[PDB]
Amino acid sequence: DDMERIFKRFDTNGDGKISLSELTDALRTLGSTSADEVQRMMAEIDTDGDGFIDFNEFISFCNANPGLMKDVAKVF
Amino acid sequence: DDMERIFKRFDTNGDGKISLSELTDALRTLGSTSADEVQRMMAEIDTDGDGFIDFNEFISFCNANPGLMKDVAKVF
Ligand SMILES: [Ca+2]
């Protein structure tokens, strides 16, 4: 039920919908991550285990997560 | 495309790979995103365009992006 729990973390007032202010506030948290949380994210994408994300790995991750380039990237 | 563009933007020292520090900076950038930029991300996920992301829309995004959700779980 992790997905529902994550949704609940985003939906501050619990009215069943994530607003602009709620999404922005949630992103603010994602950008204040600890060194170890970043390492955990690195482990997920660093498939060849060299400690870095090369372009092959980035492309592979994007192909498995179309929302990264179609949704999240629209931020940058 | 935006893939190569985004990769390059965060590969600070241009060695072709994203390090832990560079990934940390990318996350902090995402975290300091203006509501205006966040709005573009929200519009992509907000399928019915009511200005909010309901659970159904949130679920669809999660299902299509198992990798991103794993990263999010590192925080939420
Ligand atoms: Ca809400």
Ligand SMILES: [Ca+2]
């Ligand atoms: Ca690697």
Ligand SMILES: [Ca+2]
């Ligand atoms: Ca680099």
Ligand SMILES: [Ca+2]
């Ligand atoms: Ca909606």
